[PDB]
Design a protein around this ligand. Structure first.
Ligand SMILES: NC(=O)C1=CN([C@@H]2O[C@H](COP(=O)(O)OP(=O)(O)OC[C@H]3O[C@@H](n4cnc5c(N)ncnc54)[C@H](OP(=O)(O)O)[C@@H]3O)[C@@H](O)[C@H]2O)C=CC1
Ligand SMILES: COc1cc(-c2cc(C)cc(C)c2)cc([C@@H](C)C#Cc2c(C)nc(N)nc2N)c1
Length: 157
């Protein structure tokens, strides 16, 4: 299975200057629960904003750099190598990868942040006329999670 895993706001912002615009601990639990024991595929810039691989799952980084080597990170060099990865594979970022993958994915796991942030990175446009709502669950507000957010699981028509 090939899925997108993404958090984006009301205008589809996903990033500002190598950072997530928002601080949402609930969405990071959701990412852990969802992708533990599986594979995360990310572009080189996404990997570098994080800085280390996330424990307890395959970290796959797409890049053209033949020197690129990091402990605990497998490297791929074309979009086509993604389809050769065994298991449940989550496209984890960033903008350019989503742009390349959005038409090919089975499945989308979207956290909609009900806010409007300044950003420089965006998730590509999409219509619900292409996606069925498998589930929509409101995240719970908090001292720690202070921004409204909804977990969507969309599957392609
Ligand atoms: N929520 C998120 O996922 C977050 C993402 N971002 C940001 O996304 C921003 C914009 O960069 P963006 O390009 O969208 O991010 P990516 O993470 O997708 O990194 C882009 C790089 O991925 C590699 N890549 C993508 N497609 C291919 C391909 N088909 N073949 C070979 N290599 C490929 C290239 O790496 P290379 O040049 O090494 O070959 C490319 O330059 C960055 O500033 C990053 O910080 C910021 C915060 C959060
Ligand atoms: C700038 O710093 C970053 C840190 C992390 C990160 C670091 C640790 C230690 C754990 C976790 C779970 C995430 C991830 C990202 C980027 C790659 C992301 C993301 C993303 C999110 C947060 N939510 C959903 N739903 N999908 C997504 N693709 C950027």
């Amino acid at each position: 299975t090939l899925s997108i895993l993404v958090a984006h706001d009301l205008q589809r912002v996903i990033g500002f200057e190598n950072q997530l615009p928002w601080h949402l601990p609930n969405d990071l639990k959701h990412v852990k629960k969802l992708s533990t024991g599986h594979t995360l595929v990310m572009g080189r810039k996404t990997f570098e904003s994080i800085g280390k691989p996330l424990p307890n799952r395959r970290n796959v980084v797409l890049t053209s750099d033949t020197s690129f080597n990091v402990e605990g990170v497998d490297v791929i060099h074309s979009i086509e190598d993604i389809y050769q990865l065994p298991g449940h594979v989550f496209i984890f970022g960033g903008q350019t990868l989503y742009e390349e993958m959005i038409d090919k994915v089975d499945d989308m796991y979207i956290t909609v942040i009900e806010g409007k942030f300044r950003g420089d990175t965006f998730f590509p446009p999409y219509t619900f006329e292409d996606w069925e709502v498998a589930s929509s669950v409101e995240g719970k507000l908090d001292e720690k999670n202070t921004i409204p957010h909804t977990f969507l699981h969309l599957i392609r028509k």
